[PDB]
Design a protein around this ligand. Structure first.
Ligand SMILES: C[C@@H]1CC[C@@]2(OC1)O[C@H]1[C@@H](O)[C@H]3[C@@H]4CC[C@H]5C[C@@H](O[C@@H]6O[C@H](CO)[C@H](O[C@@H]7O[C@H](CO)[C@@H](O)[C@H](O[C@@H]8OC[C@@H](O)[C@H](O)[C@H]8O)[C@H]7O[C@@H]7O[C@H](CO)[C@H](O)[C@H](O[C@@H]8O[C@H](CO)[C@@H](O)[C@H](O)[C@H]8O)[C@H]7O)[C@H](O)[C@H]6O)[C@H](O)C[C@]5(C)[C@H]4CC[C@]3(C)[C@H]1[C@@H]2C
Ligand SMILES: C[C@@H]1CC[C@@]2(OC1)O[C@H]1[C@@H](O)[C@H]3[C@@H]4CC[C@H]5C[C@@H](O[C@@H]6O[C@H](CO)[C@H](O[C@@H]7O[C@H](CO)[C@@H](O)[C@H](O[C@@H]8OC[C@@H](O)[C@H](O)[C@H]8O)[C@H]7O[C@@H]7O[C@H](CO)[C@H](O)[C@H](O[C@@H]8O[C@H](CO)[C@@H](O)[C@H](O)[C@H]8O)[C@H]7O)[C@H](O)[C@H]6O)[C@H](O)C[C@]5(C)[C@H]4CC[C@]3(C)[C@H]1[C@@H]2C
Ligand SMILES: C[C@@H]1CC[C@@]2(OC1)O[C@H]1[C@@H](O)[C@H]3[C@@H]4CC[C@H]5C[C@@H](O[C@@H]6O[C@H](CO)[C@H](O[C@@H]7O[C@H](CO)[C@@H](O)[C@H](O[C@@H]8OC[C@@H](O)[C@H](O)[C@H]8O)[C@H]7O[C@@H]7O[C@H](CO)[C@H](O)[C@H](O[C@@H]8O[C@H](CO)[C@@H](O)[C@H](O)[C@H]8O)[C@H]7O)[C@H](O)[C@H]6O)[C@H](O)C[C@]5(C)[C@H]4CC[C@]3(C)[C@H]1[C@@H]2C
Ligand SMILES: CCCCCCCC/C=C\CCCCCCCC(=O)O[C@@H](COC(=O)CCCCCCCCCCCCCCC)COP(=O)([O-])OCC[N+](C)(C)C
Ligand SMILES: CCCCCCCC/C=C\CCCCCCCC(=O)O[C@@H](COC(=O)CCCCCCCCCCCCCCC)COP(=O)([O-])OCC[N+](C)(C)C
Ligand SMILES: CCCCCCCC/C=C\CCCCCCCC(=O)O[C@@H](COC(=O)CCCCCCCCCCCCCCC)COP(=O)([O-])OCC[N+](C)(C)C
Ligand SMILES: CCCCCCCC/C=C\CCCCCCCC(=O)O[C@@H](COC(=O)CCCCCCCCCCCCCCC)COP(=O)([O-])OCC[N+](C)(C)C
Ligand SMILES: CCCCCCCC/C=C\CCCCCCCC(=O)O[C@@H](COC(=O)CCCCCCCCCCCCCCC)COP(=O)([O-])OCC[N+](C)(C)C
Ligand SMILES: CCCCCCCC/C=C\CCCCCCCC(=O)O[C@@H](COC(=O)CCCCCCCCCCCCCCC)COP(=O)([O-])OCC[N+](C)(C)C
Ligand SMILES: CC(C)CCC[C@@H](C)[C@H]1CC[C@H]2[C@@H]3CC=C4C[C@@H](O)CC[C@]4(C)[C@H]3CC[C@]12C
Ligand SMILES: CC(C)CCC[C@@H](C)[C@H]1CC[C@H]2[C@@H]3CC=C4C[C@@H](O)CC[C@]4(C)[C@H]3CC[C@]12C
Ligand SMILES: [K+]
Ligand SMILES: [K+]
Ligand SMILES: [K+]
Ligand SMILES: [K+]
Lengths: 410, 82, 355
């Protein structure tokens, strides 16, 4: 009195016999309606957008219906007119069938359209409910596969103008994929465990709820494995072995994308934060180990009277290990930021408009002293263009170049 | 170029080319396609392009027969005796 | 590797099954555990993933010793085969693959010296917010992989801009970006190079390659030196009348400067006249509002109506300014003796012809 084979074989034949028919045909006014169906379901059309939003919402509803019905016996008789929840489910299913037909009549190629995820979930969803309403006896089958539509969720978030950047869209896509595969693996485990082994007259059934199977999958994939719940049936244990192996492979395949979305942390980004009752000096120019070491040795002398002045270094070249150690030794008085004086955004970052002074150090060991002097004069011009009233102390290599400083009215 | 007593298209030239893929840039009347091999292009078949890479094949030809290089040298260099 | 993994899994399961079902010999085989072979396969898989449910486990002493050895040896074996797994996985090519065409949407191929500044300026003018809706995508083709700044800039325009690693001189890469269906190819030059002539020759060779692949595609190229663009006339597929253009940077820049020497501010006027500028409403009495009133103007070309034929240029210009509120600057004069020539503000002796 268990005719689940009919429900399974319905999906099997609707997936295989029609594919074989298409293959046989290939081995051997419709254009207008095909183009109309293609433009009707196109993503550029507003009708296509509202229709895919509607089908996403109805797939969510079907998933909730499966969640409600999972607490019931898997294969049981029911009446068409005695409950309207099954009527809602079959209305959803016939809407899915109509949308599948619209996609099928608008498909440029039949074989590739017949071998995609939406087609196979429709094949495993709609013929079972047709057989159920024909025989007036339902079977909880592969209805969890509707969760596989959650992958399209990010696309909906792109149609609603909620997601704009590419990184957020890809993050939502990966999260949706992970959640959907988790839910569908839990559904397979729940079905195989609660049904029992067929060759042993279904005497191996284990009364596990769907959420206990979700919990089991989460405990397994973290490699924690409490053993409070586990699969007891032979086919369930085979499914768990396959799930462990496939999940290991899938996690290994998605490591580079996780690394890419994590990215690299900028060590010396961000902006200086002012402290009330405390001045700061911006230091720029040729920032290396020796010049900074000498300047800090005299400026932060132990015999110097208590002065509440912080030092903010601004330099585009990232410091090496020795400069990093030197900055760490004075971590309570010295901060470093990566940036250029010639960029006004970086000047706003170090709060040059409230700094007490700007000190510009020169490269004493350079091939062309005149080029170094001109670069420093241009730094002075940039700083004074941003804030004309700030005090500037600069280093000049050659004597004839400092006359250029008199050409700056600030 | 144009000349008066009429055009440079009939002037015989030979161009040395390092890359074989650049041989089809030398001719415009060719009906060749991007996937045409070097020896089937019009500039090669007409002798207006010399690809140095052919010498790389000569080494292999020398491995299977050592007299080929001697014949080529006596036919090509003008008769340089030892 | 797959065969090695499967074989060692099966033989470890066989050892565990034998030792567990036989029992300990020194205790008269009273420690036997009735485990099937497939339960031992399942046990080995659960162990080597470090999940360890504990629903099934080895109970005998020799079985537990075998399991300890299996854990240690499997750890060592997995550690030894990591480099081979990495090698077979390899490195993913970030910018491989081919451009996929979309029906009812054109695309432009951009090549040459592709860096941050040139791409930023071109995209700032091309993808302007005030630009009328144009369904044109941009496909960059360049052998040098982009850096972090170019990657961020391409990500900001991920819905309109795609990048591909490849060379213009390689016909396979030209087939990848679908140069045979592109609306145009735009070639940018390296303005900061040691030898401008070498850069110009390289760009001319890129033009030769593109025209050899597809002779009918429209090409807009940048030329550094003026004497080099004559080489473009040596290409029979180069058609100036069909839209092929060379923009000479030196000639245009120094001509702008010379015309501003004759009348200062002319370079600013011309630059604002062909650039897209967003209009800003200013109500304060400053010079910015008077400036921005005239910034919004642009150049257009139109065929004169048949009612203007036989009339002098000053008459039609005054009619356009007074009635139509349009400033007509120049006309295109055609003749049988010569080619078409652009006439800037011709005198009253000239008369408007047909078309
Ligand atoms: C929807 C497409 C079309 C083809 C198909 O699915 C895909 O349709 C499905 C559905 O129609 C199935 C039939 C539904 C009706 C069934 C009736 C059933 O008879 C029952 O047999 C019992 C044991 O004798 C009792 O008697 C009971 O009293 C009696 O009813 C029979 O044993 C199998 C049966 C005929 C089924 C065989 C397999 C199918 C034809 C399925 C088939 C795959
Ligand atoms: C628009 C988009 C798409 C997706 C979505 O919104 C967005 O669609 C929404 C909509 O579609 C929702 C569904 C609408 C229909 C709902 C039906 C509801 O079941 C009803 O629950 C009622 C509770 O009072 C009655 O149930 C009876 O309750 C009695 C006690 O009060 C029991 O006794 C008796 O048994 C029950 O009777 C139940 O129903 C039969 C009687 O008619 C049988 O007796 C059956 O046994 C029994 O169980 C009633 O009878 C039963 O029908 C179910 O709980 C939730 C439900 C499915 C909803 C779930 C969430 C949705 C999907 C929403 C979803 C978010
Ligand atoms: C995506 C969101 C989050 C998840 C959720 O909403 C949608 O899913 C909803 C749906 O799945 C709900 C369940 C549906 C099925 C329900 C069944 C009902 O009956 C009890 O069910 C038990 C088994 O679960 C017993 O067996 C026995 O049949 C009976 O005692 C139980 O009382 C509450 C119940 C489990 C519900 C609890 C609350 C939910 C989980 C809802 C929950 C918020
Ligand atoms: C069972 C376990 C299967 C595990 C492997 C799944 C591979 C999926 C796969 O290659 O999908 C690909 C093709 O999609 C197909 O080729 C789908 C083939 C469906 C076969 C269904 C048999 C029942 C990708 O699917 P998409 O639609 O291109 O996205
Ligand atoms: C069922 C669940 C399935 C998985 C669902 C996963 C959804 C996970 C939500 C967070 C996704 C990242 C959002 C983010 O970074 O900010 C975004 C804003 O924020 C939004 O647009 C929020 C959208 C919430 C839905 C983008 O901000 P920006 O890039 O600065 O522009
Ligand atoms: C988030 C909302 C989703 C889900 C929230 C949870 C919904 C299920 C709760 C109602 C069912 C319930 O408790 O009934 C019985 C089943 O008991 C269990 O199923 C307990 C195990 C649940 C572990 C958490 C599963 C969800 C994980 C996270 C899922 C993330 C997606 C009580 O059992 P008993 O009293 O032992 O008999
Ligand atoms: C709490 C969590 C629960 C999860 C439960 C377990 C779920 C997993 C169980 C099962 C899923 C198994 C198939 C995974 C998807 C295959 C198709 C695919 O997208 O390929 C991806 C990788 O693909 C792989 O990593 C190859 C998959 C090989 C499976 C071998 C199983 C052997 C038994 C594509 O990767 P990419 O980055 O595009 O490159
Ligand atoms: C693939 C085909 C290979 C193998 C397919 C499986 C073949 C074994 C099934 C027949 C034996 C069987 O169930 O009898 C009893 C033993 O029960 C068990 O052995 C259950 C544990 C099986 C877990 C999966 C093992 C194969 C893993 C994957 C191996 C990959 C290589 C039933 O026990 P009971 O009812 O609990 O009493
Ligand atoms: C589900 C899975 C089930 C698996 C069950 C457990 C099976 C494992 C249990 C046992 C197998 C143990 C021997 C492994 C093979 C040794 C020889 C060999 O090929 O060396 C390899 C590495 O080998 C080493 O690096 C040395 C390994 C020493 C193991 C010492 C164990 C001590 C206890 C050669 O490595 P290569 O990359 O060629 O270099
Ligand atoms: C990719 C998927 C759709 C194809 C794999 C086939 C799956 C769906 C099939 C193959 C074997 C099937 C199982 C075989 C036997 C039974 C016992 C019975 O009480 C119904 C459910 C259950 C437990 C079946 C569920 C569906 C099942 C797991
Ligand atoms: C390289 C491999 C072949 C060498 C490993 C040694 C093998 C041959 C030996 C070492 C100890 C042996 C076990 C010792 C005791 C018993 C109990 C008895 O009921 C027979 C099987 C069993 C369980 C033996 C199986 C074979 C065994 C595992
Ligand atoms: K454990
Ligand atoms: K345990
Ligand atoms: K455990
Ligand atoms: K303008």
């Amino acid at each position: 009195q268990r005719m689940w084979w009919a429900f399974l074989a319905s999906s099997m034949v609707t997936f295989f016999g029609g594919l074989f028919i298409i293959l046989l045909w290939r081995t051997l006014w419709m254009t207008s309606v095909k183009d109309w169906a293609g433009v009707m379901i196109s993503a550029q059309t507003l009708t296509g957008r509202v229709l895919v939003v509607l089908v996403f919402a109805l797939s969510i509803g079907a998933l909730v219906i499966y969640f409600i019905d999972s607490s019931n016996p898997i294969e049981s008789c029911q009446n068409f007119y005695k409950d309207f929840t099954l009527q809602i489910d079959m209305a959803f299913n016939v809407f899915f069938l109509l949308y599948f037909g619209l996609r099928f009549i608008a498909a440029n190629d039949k074989l590739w359209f017949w071998l995609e995820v939406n087609s196979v979930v429709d094949f495993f969803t709609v013929p079972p409910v047709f057989v159920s309403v024909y025989l007036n006896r339902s079977w909880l089958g592969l209805r969890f596969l509707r969760a596989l539509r959650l992958i399209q969720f990010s696309e909906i978030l792109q149609f609603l103008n909620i997601l704009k950047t590419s990184n957020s869209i890809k993050l939502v896509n990966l999260l949706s994929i992970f959640i959907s595969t988790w839910l569908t693996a839990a559904g397979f485990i729940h079905l195989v465990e609660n049904s029992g082994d067929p060759w042993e007259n279904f005497q191996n059934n284990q009364a596990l709820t769907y959420w206990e199977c979700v919990y089991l999958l989460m405990v397994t994939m973290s490699t924690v494995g409490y053993g409070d719940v586990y699969a007891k049936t032979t086919l369930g244990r085979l499914f768990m072995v396959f799930f462990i192996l496939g999940g290991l492979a899938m996690a290994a395949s998605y490591v580079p994308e996780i690394i890419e979305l994590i990215g690299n942390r900028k060590k010396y980004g961000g902006s200086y934060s002012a402290v009330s009752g405390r001045k700061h000096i911006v230091v720029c120019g040729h920032i290396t180990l020796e010049s900074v070491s000498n300047f800090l040795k005299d400026f932060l002398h132990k015999d110097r009277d208590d002065v509440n002045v912080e030092i903010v270094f601004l330099h585009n070249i990232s410091p090496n290990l020795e400069l990093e150690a030197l900055f760490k030794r004075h971590f309570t008085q010295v901060e470093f930021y990566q940036g250029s004086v010639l960029n006004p955004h970086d000047l706003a970052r170090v709060k040059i408009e409230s700094a007490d002074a700007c000190l510009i150090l020169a490269n004493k060991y350079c091939a062309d002293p005149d080029a170094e002097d001109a670069s420093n004069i241009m730094r002075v011009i940039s700083i004074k263009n941003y804030h004309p009233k700030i005090r500037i102390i600069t280093q000049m290599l050659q004597y004839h170049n400092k006359a250029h400083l008199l050409n700056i009215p600030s | 170029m144009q000349f008066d007593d009429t055009t440079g298209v009939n002037i015989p030239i030979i161009t040395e080319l390092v890359n074989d893929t650049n041989v089809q840039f030398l001719d415009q009347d060719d009906d060749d396609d991007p996937d045409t091999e070097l020896y089937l292009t019009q500039p090669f078949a007409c002798g207006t392009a010399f690809a140095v890479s052919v010498l790389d094949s000569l080494m292999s030809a020398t491995y299977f027969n050592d007299n080929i290089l001697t014949l080529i040298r006596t036919l090509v260099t003008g008769g340089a005796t030892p | 590797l797959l065969s090695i993994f499967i074989s060692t899994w099966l033989t470890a399961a066989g050892f565990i099954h034998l030792v567990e079902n036989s029992g300990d010999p020194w205790e008269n085989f009273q420690n036997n555990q009735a485990l099937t072979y497939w339960e031992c396969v399942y046990l080995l898989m659960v162990t080597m993933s470090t999940v360890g449910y504990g629903d099934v486990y080895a109970k005998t002493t020799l079985g537990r010793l075998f399991m300890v050895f299996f854990i240690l040896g499997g750890l060592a074996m997995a550690a030894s085969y990591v480099p081979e797994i990495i090698e077979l996985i390899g490195n993913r090519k970030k910018y491989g693959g081919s451009y996929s065409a979309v029906s009812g949407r054109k695309h432009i191929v951009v090549c040459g010296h592709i860096t941050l500044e040139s791409v930023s300026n071109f995209l700032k003018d091309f993808l302007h917010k005030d630009r009328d809706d144009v369904n044109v995508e941009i496909v960059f083709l360049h052998n040098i992989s982009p850096n972090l700044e170019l990657e961020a800039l391409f990500k900001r325009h991920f819905t309109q801009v795609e990048f591909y690693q490849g060379s213009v001189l390689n016909p396979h890469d030209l087939a990848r970006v679908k140069i045979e269906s592109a609306d145009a190819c735009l070639i940018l030059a390296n303005k900061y190079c040691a030898d401008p002539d070498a850069e110009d020759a390289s760009n001319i060779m890129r033009v030769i390659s593109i025209k050899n692949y597809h002779p009918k595609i429209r090409i807009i190229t940048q030329m550094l030196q003026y004497h080099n663009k004559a080489h473009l006339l040596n290409i029979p597929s180069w058609n100036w009348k069909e839209g092929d253009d060379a923009i000479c940077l030196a000639e245009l820049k120094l001509g702008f400067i010379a015309q501003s020497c004759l009348a200062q501010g002319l370079s600013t006027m011309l630059a604002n006249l062909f650039s897209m500028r967003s209009f800003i409403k200013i109500e304060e009495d400053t010079w910015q509002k008077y400036y921005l009133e005239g910034v919004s103007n642009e150049m257009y070309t139109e065929y004169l109506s048949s009612a203007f034929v036989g009339l002098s240029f000053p008459t039609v210009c005054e009619l356009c300014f007074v009635k139509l509120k349009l400033l007509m600057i120049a006309i295109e004069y055609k003749s049988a003796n010569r080619e078409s020539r652009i006439l800037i503000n011709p005198g009253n002796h000239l008369k408007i012809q047909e078309g």
